[PDB]
């Protein structure tokens, strides 16, 4: 039974990555939004 659950302990060490993927979305959006907004700043002059 301990081995059965020793394996589960590793199964659980194996959500952070999906948040990491999200981290990159956060980065891309803000980076590109700054460019979109500067393009808007000119359009809005």
């Amino acid at each position: 039974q301990q081995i059965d659950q020793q394996i589960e302990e590793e199964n659980i060490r194996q959500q952070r990555k999906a948040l990491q993927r999200e981290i990159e979305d956060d980065v891309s959006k803000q980076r590109e939004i700054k460019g979109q907004l500067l393009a808007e700043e000119f359009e809005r002059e």
Partner: peptide, 23 residues
């Protein structure tokens, strides 16, 4: 005596098995 032997040795397989599960 041989049974306690074989058991105490056998258990170390179980600890190698732990090493094997870690791989």
């Amino acid at each position: 005596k041989m049974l306690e032997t074989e058991i105490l040795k056998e258990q170390q397989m179980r600890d190698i098995e732990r090493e094997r599960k870690l791989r």
